[PDB]
Amino acid sequence: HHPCCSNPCQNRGECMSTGFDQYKCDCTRTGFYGENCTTPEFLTRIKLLLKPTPNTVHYILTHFKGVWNIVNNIPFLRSLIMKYVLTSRSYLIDSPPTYNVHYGYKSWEAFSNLSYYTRALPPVADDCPTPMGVKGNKELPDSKEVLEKVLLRREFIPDPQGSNMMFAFFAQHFTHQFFKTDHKRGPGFTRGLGHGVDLNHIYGETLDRQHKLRLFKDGKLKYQVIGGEVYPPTVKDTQVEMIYPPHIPENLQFAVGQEVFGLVPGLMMYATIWLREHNRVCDILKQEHPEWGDEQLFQTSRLILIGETIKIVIEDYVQHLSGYHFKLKFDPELLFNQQFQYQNRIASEFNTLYHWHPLLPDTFNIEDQEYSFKQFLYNNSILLEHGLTQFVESFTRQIAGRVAGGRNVPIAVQAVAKASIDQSREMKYQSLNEYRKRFSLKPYTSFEELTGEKEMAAELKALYSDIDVMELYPALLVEKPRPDAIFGETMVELGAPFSLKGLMGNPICSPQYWKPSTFGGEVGFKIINTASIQSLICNNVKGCPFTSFNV
Amino acid sequence: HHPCCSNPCQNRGECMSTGFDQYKCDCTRTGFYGENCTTPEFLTRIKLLLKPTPNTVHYILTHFKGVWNIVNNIPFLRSLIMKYVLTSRSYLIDSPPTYNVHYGYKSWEAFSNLSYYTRALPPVADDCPTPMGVKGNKELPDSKEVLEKVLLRREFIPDPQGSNMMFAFFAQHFTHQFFKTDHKRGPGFTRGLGHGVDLNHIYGETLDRQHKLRLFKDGKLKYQVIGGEVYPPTVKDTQVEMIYPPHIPENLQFAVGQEVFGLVPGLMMYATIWLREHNRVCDILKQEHPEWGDEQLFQTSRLILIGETIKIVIEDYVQHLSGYHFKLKFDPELLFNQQFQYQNRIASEFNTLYHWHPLLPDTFNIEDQEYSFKQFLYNNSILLEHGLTQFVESFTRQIAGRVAGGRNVPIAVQAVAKASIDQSREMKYQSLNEYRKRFSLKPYTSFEELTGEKEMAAELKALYSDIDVMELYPALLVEKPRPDAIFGETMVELGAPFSLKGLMGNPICSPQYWKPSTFGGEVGFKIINTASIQSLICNNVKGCPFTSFNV
Ligand code: HEM
Ligand code: HEM
Ligand SMILES: *[C@@H]1O[C@H](CO)[C@@H](O[C@@H]2O[C@H](CO)[C@@H](O[C@@H]3O[C@H](CO)[C@@H](O)[C@H](O)[C@@H]3O)[C@H](O)[C@H]2NC(C)=O)[C@H](O)[C@H]1NC(C)=O
Ligand SMILES: *[C@@H]1O[C@H](CO)[C@@H](O[C@@H]2O[C@H](CO)[C@@H](O)[C@H](O)[C@H]2NC(C)=O)[C@H](O)[C@H]1NC(C)=O
Ligand SMILES: *[C@@H]1O[C@H](CO)[C@@H](O[C@H]2O[C@H](CO)[C@@H](O)[C@H](O)[C@H]2NC(C)=O)[C@H](O)[C@H]1NC(C)=O
Ligand SMILES: *[C@@H]1O[C@H](CO)[C@@H](O[C@H]2O[C@H](CO)[C@@H](O)[C@H](O)[C@H]2NC(C)=O)[C@H](O)[C@H]1NC(C)=O
Ligand SMILES: CS(=O)(=O)Nc1ccc([N+](=O)[O-])cc1OC1CCCCC1
Ligand SMILES: CS(=O)(=O)Nc1ccc([N+](=O)[O-])cc1OC1CCCCC1
Ligand SMILES: CCCCCCCCO[C@@H]1O[C@H](CO)[C@@H](O)[C@H](O)[C@H]1O
Ligand SMILES: *[C@@H]1O[C@H](CO)[C@@H](O)[C@H](O)[C@H]1NC(C)=O
Ligand SMILES: *[C@@H]1O[C@H](CO)[C@@H](O)[C@H](O)[C@H]1NC(C)=O
């Protein structure tokens, strides 16, 4: 079997087999040397003694309101802090990308084939003695048992940060432009070849789909008016394929950019908001540019909406998640004096960690209805009976579930949580502790240390034996969360790098693009640079309801 | 008609229409301001005063042989010079890319659709009063007339730099991995979606083709043995599509990575050399790695060959072209402390300028045969009749034609030269002088100044009227060349940026890839870092003949 199964190489050094039973580590630019890249260079030891731990930096950012209010208001100083956040996170990601499910060594196939999700760590080799490498038993614990003992929800657990349903559905809507697993092929594959924020969930992945949804007048997307209100067009009308079950009335089969968004009214809400937003921007642009044709109006709006999305994600969405008193900034300019790759590749592990189903409540509370999952799923008529305004008002009020901390995955979606484990396993994911090391974190030394608690840790011990064979997905959902927070440490420390690179790594953030001319002048550039979750809802939802990502 | 037709914005500022008859320049980061980006900031004026002209820098590098021998031998100092060469050229290229034949403004379509060649300058708008913008006549001179008066060859003109046929065919073979125009679609489109040095002309563009050419044993490519010598397999044996005319014997229908390489024995020679090289490297790797399977052997050899190719292109091929006494270096490490994008996109204008047909001789002299074009094209039996060794020996001896300076396109390929003009026109190429400005060069003020000569200038004047409507392609092939050089100034000053970005912009040059482990250890890394045109021929051609890029 493979020499590198034990994952002997430390500190991001590369393991390469040298014989049938021997291996060599490659310690190039790791700042370490010796057989396993475990001995630090001199300047490395100074830099490690100094560099503070992530839980420390987190505390700092979530305390001392006073000091931050000073910082938040000195532009130079805020820019500098944001610049540190962006760069330190960034250089934790391989870019251009390296590994995938089929390639544990770098290769032209792995690089050039955009069908694969990339991989943060190589897969465990097809022939290691144990699933996780060398440690633990011949088989991993049964996945249903892992699910039931520590993932499934007993009483619903509210998010202490107060994330609402507006947040949850925004998260789902947003991430599903670049988490589009190609199930024909397998879990390691993707239909999202844009590999990032290209708004293909609004505009469509292929050109054939885009052209089927476009109106071809003033840049606008096709739509329909029902009860005086703007909604997406139908499958029948556009010829755009959508996943709907047979029993659905043809006029409630809305056709949007992403074929799965019919499944959930929460998604279809955002689909509609974003369709309205596009056409609003075409309207603004048609006024500033009477000379432009349909094509440029469409193209330009899309770039404006990309910018808006990135802005809202950073300054509202990520902001809300962070819990920081520091105010994050979307300013491409902060990277212009930096080594940064304006490219992205969606990593499988990023997809895994973003399975935030604990957010989902037991029932959906719109107006004074309470809808079971069975009631909610597919029922686009709920979105019409109540209308967008009541949706926004109710979803802003209803609280989401806590993700970390264990035992909060809704029973209605248990099959989904199971599949995340089973697919982790098919894709030969490395262990929790390997990922922690990969992103510069002390490996958990015991289950009690991981959960911060005795009861679930005991259950996990009798399922896994060794903390070092604990799997990544279940770990994320049971981890002791930061104090009064939604996530544990691993979730943030893996997630933030992928997230920021997904956002900042967009071509529109590049110097040659980040100019007002790209967005049709001062006006367009201004739309992007003052966008917010609130302005998005306000401009496009009748009555301009107040919204935020928290109750 | 479009406000921006005059190309009013200077110094890389972006023109955007603002009404039906008005426009606005965007001078962001140009270092200039004012209505047309014509007035320099203070620090700009200092930097422009100081910065020496390209003809000056060229002279320096091609004289003072003594001084350079000192430089060539102080590693620190050579590294510093090479670093300047790489960065100054690089920041002339839009990366991530911007315009294409269909998009004169930035757009997601332009960015994300890999089917288009990118564009260094936007196309002239579909509705301008004149083909070149506003200046010149309603029609451009007849392309057949431009060809005949100043492009077609009278007396063959030898290249004063002494480039041989080994150079010419290397150029053709190399560039044809990324100049693969998709003629079904149109001149602005490409079949080479790798957009750079991915060796698809050896391994094939799609995975189907690759799998059809692979042996699946020890990493090797399929081959046949004829007269004791290794040659490519056949179309019949592999099922790999190739462009051969019907009359060709099935056993001389060799199947290589790139479908057009049957056309010309010169190409089939390199095809065979590179196939031999791949298999050689599999052999070396199999010895260093008895534990590796077929897949990793193949994959790793490919990476080694990408490195070899890049090395040979920089240190031999570009070296020979340059005429420099300074010795260029392929060292990815020189870019690690720099802002550099590890991505490439083949520009259309890069394709246009590389149509170096003047290189071709009137007849092909192999051993003591002289072959007409009619005799040469398609005759793969010539390559067997003489064998690779005699091919290398004869091609190394036979001198190529001068490219710049006018009147040196072989009559046999006149249709090709015409199409380069006609397609420049279909793709709405901007004028010569616009491209000179785009790459930081004084616009030519007269034809006499362009050609350095009176006779052709007179002919051109009576064809174009205004120097400012002179087309890019014909200009390249008539330009006054640098003294005793193959090319004129424009050719180098446009080409070099595209070239270096094509080479350095490869993923294997990125810090995460540029490690010995990527190439299977010290041995593989060493193959790459000591590769040359000689060693390539020596290792793979019977008898190890001496070769170089010049007679
Ligand atoms: C109540 C609404 C929801 C339902 C019915 C639902 C159900 C599902 C189902 C059936 C899958 C199948 C894909 C797989 O097997 O991996 C899936 C995938 C996924 N879900 Fe959800 N989920 C919901 C909400 C959410 C939310 C709020 C998030 C938060 C971000 C989320 C994140 C994800 C992600 C990242 C995937 C991966 C699928 C892919 O890669 O295409 N889901 N969900
Ligand atoms: C063996 C002699 C050669 C012949 C018969 C030949 C023939 C051709 C032909 C028929 C085309 C297609 C023209 C079109 O677009 O319709 C072409 C394109 C081209 N040629 Fe040549 N050529 C020869 C040598 C060379 C050499 C020595 C170079 C050196 C760089 C070269 C560079 C190119 C390039 C860059 C293209 C563009 C092809 C594309 O866009 O895919 N050729 N050649
Ligand atoms: C890359 O951009 C190119 C060039 O625009 C895209 O090619 C184009 O694809 C369309 C639609 O898929 C072609 O077909 C035309 O549309 C209708 C659809 O109802 C179809 O039935 C007809 O056959 C019709 O001709 C269009 O001609 C084609 N343009 C070409 C070949 O020049 C290509 O799809 C883009 N790639 C991606 C990934 O978007
Ligand atoms: C990306 O990789 C996939 C998977 O390796 C390639 O798909 C394979 O293609 C071969 C030959 O066409 C088939 O025999 C396999 O069945 C395919 N795997 C599948 C369908 O899952 C795919 O071709 C590669 N991408 C590109 C752009 O070439
Ligand atoms: C580097 O890591 C390797 C592989 O994990 C270490 O392997 C050794 O440690 C085992 C655990 O006690 C020994 O009992 C094994 O015999 C031994 N395995 C070998 C040599 O393959 C190794 O000690 C490490 N080396 C250094 C210098 O730290
Ligand atoms: C910027 O460029 C434009 C055109 O290139 C200039 O426009 C005018 O130039 C002349 C001098 O004012 C006029 O007589 C022309 O009518 C007009 N040219 C065209 C083609 O419309 C403009 O002046 C320039 N700006 C500055 C500050 O010089
Ligand atoms: C660059 S960042 O500011 O450090 N991102 C980030 C910081 C802190 C938290 N958090 O919940 O403590 C979440 C974050 O966002 C990512 C967004 C994607 C999911 C994972 C966390
Ligand atoms: C980066 S570089 O070293 O400055 N390139 C370069 C310098 C000088 C010459 N030349 O002909 O004197 C050719 C060059 O290469 C390119 C090769 C492709 C065509 C254009 C010139
Ligand atoms: C509602 C989801 C639970 C379904 C049964 C899961 C199988 C048993 O799960 C058990 O739950 C008990 C109470 O939470 C705990 O005391 C035990 O640690 C746990 O093993
Ligand atoms: C769809 O929602 C409506 C409310 O408009 C509800 O009456 C109905 O039960 C739902 N359909 C299903 C199948 O649950
Ligand atoms: C190929 O070369 C041979 C060399 O003897 C010559 O007779 C002829 O011109 C060529 N023939 C064909 C069919 O290509």
Short mmCIF file of C-alpha atoms in Angstrom, two decimals, chain B residues 81-386:
data_model
loop_
_atom_site.label_atom_id
_atom_site.label_comp_id
_atom_site.label_asym_id
_atom_site.label_seq_id
_atom_site.Cartn_x
_atom_site.Cartn_y
_atom_site.Cartn_z
CA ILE B 81 18.00 41.92 -15.61
CA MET B 82 15.74 38.96 -16.52
CA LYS B 83 13.29 40.09 -13.78
CA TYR B 84 13.07 43.54 -15.44
CA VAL B 85 12.49 41.96 -18.90
CA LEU B 86 9.64 39.81 -17.54
CA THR B 87 7.75 42.52 -15.58
CA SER B 88 8.03 45.42 -18.03
CA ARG B 89 6.67 43.25 -20.88
CA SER B 90 4.01 41.67 -18.65
CA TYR B 91 2.12 44.70 -17.46
CA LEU B 92 1.26 45.58 -21.08
CA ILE B 93 -1.30 42.72 -21.23
CA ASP B 94 -4.87 42.75 -19.88
CA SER B 95 -5.04 39.82 -17.43
CA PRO B 96 -7.72 38.65 -16.59
CA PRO B 97 -8.59 39.40 -20.27
CA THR B 98 -11.08 41.94 -21.55
CA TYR B 99 -12.27 42.48 -25.12
CA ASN B 100 -13.01 40.06 -27.99
CA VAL B 101 -14.27 40.26 -31.61
CA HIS B 102 -17.87 40.60 -30.38
CA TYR B 103 -17.31 42.75 -27.32
CA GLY B 104 -15.68 46.17 -27.50
CA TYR B 105 -16.73 46.69 -23.85
CA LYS B 106 -15.90 44.44 -20.87
CA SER B 107 -18.52 41.78 -20.17
CA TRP B 108 -19.02 38.46 -18.52
CA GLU B 109 -19.49 36.85 -21.93
CA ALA B 110 -16.18 38.19 -23.14
CA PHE B 111 -14.41 37.06 -19.96
CA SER B 112 -15.90 33.60 -19.43
CA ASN B 113 -16.35 32.24 -23.01
CA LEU B 114 -13.05 30.45 -23.75
CA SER B 115 -14.05 29.93 -27.39
CA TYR B 116 -13.04 33.47 -28.33
CA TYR B 117 -9.48 34.60 -28.78
CA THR B 118 -9.15 37.63 -26.52
CA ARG B 119 -8.34 41.07 -28.01
CA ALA B 120 -5.62 43.54 -27.09
CA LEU B 121 -7.68 46.41 -28.55
CA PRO B 122 -11.50 46.45 -29.01
CA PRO B 123 -12.90 46.00 -32.48
CA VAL B 124 -13.79 49.11 -34.48
CA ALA B 125 -17.57 49.49 -34.00
CA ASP B 126 -19.88 47.93 -36.61
CA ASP B 127 -21.16 51.41 -37.63
CA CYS B 128 -18.16 53.82 -37.94
CA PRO B 129 -17.98 55.89 -41.12
CA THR B 130 -14.67 54.29 -42.24
CA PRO B 131 -13.23 50.77 -41.76
CA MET B 132 -10.48 52.09 -39.46
CA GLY B 133 -12.68 54.51 -37.48
CA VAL B 134 -13.07 58.00 -39.01
CA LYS B 135 -9.86 58.55 -41.03
CA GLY B 136 -9.19 57.24 -44.58
CA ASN B 137 -11.54 56.19 -47.40
CA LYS B 138 -14.94 54.41 -47.19
CA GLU B 139 -13.16 51.22 -48.32
CA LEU B 140 -9.68 49.85 -47.58
CA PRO B 141 -7.39 49.07 -50.53
CA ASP B 142 -8.05 45.75 -52.27
CA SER B 143 -6.25 43.08 -50.24
CA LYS B 144 -5.00 41.33 -53.42
CA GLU B 145 -3.29 44.58 -54.41
CA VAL B 146 -1.66 45.18 -50.99
CA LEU B 147 -0.35 41.59 -51.14
CA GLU B 148 1.12 41.87 -54.63
CA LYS B 149 2.69 45.30 -54.44
CA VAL B 150 4.53 44.88 -51.12
CA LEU B 151 4.16 41.38 -49.62
CA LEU B 152 4.83 38.80 -52.34
CA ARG B 153 8.40 37.69 -52.88
CA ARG B 154 10.51 38.53 -55.91
CA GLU B 155 14.10 37.45 -55.10
CA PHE B 156 14.11 35.25 -51.92
CA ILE B 157 15.47 37.35 -49.04
CA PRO B 158 17.62 35.44 -46.53
CA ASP B 159 17.28 36.18 -42.83
CA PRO B 160 20.36 38.16 -41.79
CA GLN B 161 20.15 36.58 -38.29
CA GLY B 162 20.59 33.19 -39.98
CA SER B 163 17.49 31.44 -38.63
CA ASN B 164 17.34 27.98 -40.18
CA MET B 165 14.52 25.56 -41.02
CA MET B 166 14.87 23.92 -37.59
CA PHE B 167 13.83 27.25 -36.17
CA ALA B 168 10.99 27.83 -38.64
CA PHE B 169 9.35 24.45 -38.11
CA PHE B 170 9.84 24.71 -34.36
CA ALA B 171 8.01 28.04 -34.47
CA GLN B 172 5.21 26.52 -36.48
CA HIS B 173 4.93 23.38 -34.37
CA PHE B 174 5.07 25.30 -31.08
CA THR B 175 2.59 28.08 -31.87
CA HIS B 176 0.10 25.66 -33.37
CA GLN B 177 -0.85 24.33 -29.96
CA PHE B 178 -2.52 27.71 -29.18
CA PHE B 179 -3.25 29.09 -32.61
CA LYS B 180 -6.06 26.74 -33.53
CA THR B 181 -8.68 28.95 -35.24
CA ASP B 182 -12.18 27.45 -35.22
CA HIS B 183 -13.16 27.99 -38.84
CA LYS B 184 -16.71 26.59 -38.47
CA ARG B 185 -17.29 29.55 -36.07
CA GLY B 186 -15.11 32.33 -37.53
CA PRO B 187 -11.65 33.93 -37.31
CA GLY B 188 -12.22 35.29 -33.77
CA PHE B 189 -12.70 31.82 -32.33
CA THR B 190 -10.33 29.11 -31.16
CA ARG B 191 -10.24 25.35 -30.67
CA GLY B 192 -7.32 25.74 -28.23
CA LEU B 193 -9.21 26.26 -24.99
CA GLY B 194 -6.06 25.66 -22.96
CA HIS B 195 -4.98 29.11 -24.06
CA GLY B 196 -1.25 28.48 -23.84
CA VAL B 197 1.45 25.89 -23.40
CA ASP B 198 -0.48 22.74 -22.51
CA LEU B 199 1.10 20.54 -25.19
CA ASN B 200 -2.29 19.63 -26.65
CA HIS B 201 -0.56 19.35 -30.01
CA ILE B 202 1.16 16.28 -28.56
CA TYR B 203 -1.47 14.93 -26.17
CA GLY B 204 -4.67 16.14 -27.82
CA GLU B 205 -7.18 18.84 -26.82
CA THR B 206 -9.98 16.54 -25.51
CA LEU B 207 -9.65 13.57 -23.16
CA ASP B 208 -11.11 11.24 -25.80
CA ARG B 209 -8.26 12.05 -28.17
CA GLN B 210 -5.67 11.72 -25.38
CA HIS B 211 -6.99 8.31 -24.40
CA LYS B 212 -6.94 7.23 -28.03
CA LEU B 213 -3.20 8.08 -28.36
CA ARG B 214 -2.08 6.69 -24.99
CA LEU B 215 -0.67 3.19 -24.67
CA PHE B 216 -1.74 2.76 -21.02
CA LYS B 217 1.50 1.06 -20.08
CA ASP B 218 4.27 2.89 -18.19
CA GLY B 219 2.71 6.28 -19.03
CA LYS B 220 3.59 6.02 -22.69
CA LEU B 221 2.03 7.33 -25.89
CA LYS B 222 1.26 4.75 -28.60
CA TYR B 223 3.78 4.51 -31.44
CA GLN B 224 5.00 2.23 -34.23
CA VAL B 225 8.44 1.00 -35.30
CA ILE B 226 9.36 1.40 -38.96
CA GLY B 227 12.84 0.44 -40.13
CA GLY B 228 13.90 0.14 -36.50
CA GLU B 229 12.83 3.74 -35.80
CA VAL B 230 10.04 5.04 -33.52
CA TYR B 231 7.22 6.88 -35.29
CA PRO B 232 3.64 7.89 -34.42
CA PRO B 233 0.81 5.36 -34.71
CA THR B 234 -1.71 5.43 -37.59
CA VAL B 235 -5.19 6.90 -37.94
CA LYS B 236 -6.39 3.32 -38.61
CA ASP B 237 -4.76 1.91 -35.43
CA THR B 238 -5.88 4.68 -33.03
CA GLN B 239 -9.13 6.04 -34.55
CA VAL B 240 -7.74 9.56 -34.05
CA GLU B 241 -9.08 12.01 -36.69
CA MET B 242 -6.44 13.74 -38.88
CA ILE B 243 -6.54 16.12 -41.88
CA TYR B 244 -5.12 14.09 -44.77
CA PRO B 245 -6.20 14.24 -48.39
CA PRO B 246 -7.72 10.95 -49.74
CA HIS B 247 -4.75 9.84 -51.90
CA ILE B 248 -2.53 9.14 -48.85
CA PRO B 249 -1.39 5.58 -47.97
CA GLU B 250 -3.00 4.52 -44.65
CA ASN B 251 0.40 3.66 -43.08
CA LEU B 252 1.71 7.23 -43.65
CA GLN B 253 -1.37 8.72 -42.00
CA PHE B 254 0.34 9.32 -38.66
CA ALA B 255 -1.92 10.33 -35.77
CA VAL B 256 -0.56 12.98 -33.45
CA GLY B 257 -2.09 15.36 -30.89
CA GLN B 258 -2.82 18.14 -33.33
CA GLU B 259 -4.98 17.19 -36.36
CA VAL B 260 -3.19 19.47 -38.86
CA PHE B 261 0.39 18.18 -38.39
CA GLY B 262 0.13 15.69 -41.25
CA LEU B 263 0.06 18.59 -43.71
CA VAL B 264 3.78 19.27 -43.42
CA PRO B 265 6.80 16.93 -42.93
CA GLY B 266 8.58 19.64 -40.89
CA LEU B 267 5.76 19.42 -38.36
CA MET B 268 5.65 15.65 -38.44
CA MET B 269 9.38 15.69 -37.62
CA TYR B 270 8.76 17.63 -34.40
CA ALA B 271 5.64 15.53 -33.66
CA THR B 272 7.87 12.45 -33.75
CA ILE B 273 10.69 14.02 -31.73
CA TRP B 274 8.27 15.10 -29.03
CA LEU B 275 6.56 11.71 -28.98
CA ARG B 276 9.96 10.10 -28.51
CA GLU B 277 10.74 12.61 -25.75
CA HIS B 278 7.55 11.83 -23.84
CA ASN B 279 8.30 8.14 -23.89
CA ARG B 280 11.95 8.70 -22.88
CA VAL B 281 10.71 10.60 -19.80
CA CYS B 282 8.27 7.85 -18.90
CA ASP B 283 11.29 5.50 -19.02
CA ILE B 284 13.35 7.64 -16.69
CA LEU B 285 10.41 8.05 -14.31
CA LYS B 286 9.57 4.32 -14.28
CA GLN B 287 13.08 3.73 -13.03
CA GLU B 288 12.91 6.38 -10.30
CA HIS B 289 9.37 5.28 -9.39
CA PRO B 290 8.79 1.56 -9.72
CA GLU B 291 5.74 2.08 -7.44
CA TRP B 292 3.89 4.53 -9.77
CA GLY B 293 1.10 3.34 -12.11
CA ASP B 294 0.45 4.28 -15.74
CA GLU B 295 -1.73 7.32 -14.96
CA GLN B 296 0.85 9.16 -12.79
CA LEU B 297 3.71 8.35 -15.14
CA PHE B 298 1.77 9.82 -18.04
CA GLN B 299 0.52 12.83 -16.09
CA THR B 300 3.97 13.66 -14.65
CA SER B 301 5.79 13.27 -17.99
CA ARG B 302 3.36 15.81 -19.45
CA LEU B 303 4.29 18.34 -16.79
CA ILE B 304 8.00 17.73 -17.45
CA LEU B 305 7.44 18.26 -21.14
CA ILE B 306 5.55 21.49 -20.50
CA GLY B 307 8.62 22.64 -18.51
CA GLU B 308 11.03 21.48 -21.20
CA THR B 309 9.03 23.35 -23.82
CA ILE B 310 8.98 26.56 -21.79
CA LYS B 311 12.72 26.30 -21.11
CA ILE B 312 13.58 25.67 -24.77
CA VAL B 313 11.35 28.55 -25.87
CA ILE B 314 12.97 31.05 -23.51
CA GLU B 315 16.66 30.08 -23.54
CA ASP B 316 17.04 28.97 -27.18
CA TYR B 317 14.11 30.05 -29.32
CA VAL B 318 13.46 33.53 -27.94
CA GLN B 319 17.24 33.91 -27.31
CA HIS B 320 17.94 33.27 -30.99
CA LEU B 321 15.21 35.71 -32.06
CA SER B 322 16.40 38.44 -29.68
CA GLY B 323 20.00 38.70 -30.98
CA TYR B 324 20.86 39.72 -27.40
CA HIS B 325 24.28 39.14 -25.82
CA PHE B 326 22.42 38.93 -22.50
CA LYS B 327 21.43 35.34 -21.69
CA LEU B 328 17.72 34.96 -20.91
CA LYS B 329 16.72 32.67 -18.04
CA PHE B 330 13.68 30.52 -17.41
CA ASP B 331 13.28 30.80 -13.67
CA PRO B 332 9.74 30.94 -12.26
CA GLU B 333 11.34 32.06 -8.96
CA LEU B 334 11.97 35.51 -10.42
CA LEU B 335 8.23 36.22 -10.22
CA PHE B 336 7.54 35.07 -6.65
CA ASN B 337 8.11 38.56 -5.20
CA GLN B 338 5.94 40.16 -7.91
CA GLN B 339 2.35 40.86 -8.81
CA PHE B 340 1.74 38.38 -11.61
CA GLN B 341 -1.28 36.52 -12.88
CA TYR B 342 -0.73 32.83 -13.48
CA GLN B 343 -3.26 32.78 -16.26
CA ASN B 344 -3.25 33.33 -20.02
CA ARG B 345 -5.69 34.04 -22.86
CA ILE B 346 -4.53 33.95 -26.45
CA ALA B 347 -5.05 37.27 -28.13
CA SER B 348 -6.18 37.46 -31.72
CA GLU B 349 -3.54 40.07 -32.56
CA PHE B 350 -0.94 37.71 -31.15
CA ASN B 351 -2.13 35.12 -33.67
CA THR B 352 -2.04 37.69 -36.53
CA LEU B 353 1.52 38.82 -35.83
CA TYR B 354 2.79 35.26 -35.71
CA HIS B 355 1.95 34.56 -39.36
CA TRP B 356 5.65 34.34 -40.20
CA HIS B 357 5.29 32.88 -43.66
CA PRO B 358 8.24 34.90 -45.05
CA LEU B 359 10.38 32.37 -43.16
CA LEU B 360 9.56 29.69 -45.74
CA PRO B 361 12.08 29.02 -48.57
CA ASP B 362 11.23 28.58 -52.26
CA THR B 363 12.18 24.87 -52.09
CA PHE B 364 12.93 22.41 -49.28
CA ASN B 365 16.48 21.05 -49.36
CA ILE B 366 16.70 17.67 -47.67
CA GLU B 367 19.97 15.77 -48.35
CA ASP B 368 20.52 16.46 -52.03
CA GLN B 369 16.82 16.70 -52.96
CA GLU B 370 15.11 20.00 -53.62
CA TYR B 371 11.35 19.77 -53.11
CA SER B 372 8.77 22.20 -54.41
CA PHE B 373 5.89 23.08 -52.06
CA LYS B 374 3.63 20.77 -54.05
CA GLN B 375 6.17 17.99 -53.52
CA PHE B 376 6.67 18.85 -49.85
CA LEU B 377 3.13 19.33 -48.53
CA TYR B 378 1.60 16.03 -47.34
CA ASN B 379 4.56 13.86 -48.29
CA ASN B 380 5.19 11.95 -45.06
CA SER B 381 7.18 9.50 -47.15
CA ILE B 382 9.93 12.13 -47.48
CA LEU B 383 10.34 11.85 -43.71
CA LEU B 384 10.76 8.09 -44.05
CA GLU B 385 12.84 8.17 -47.24
CA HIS B 386 15.44 10.37 -45.52
#
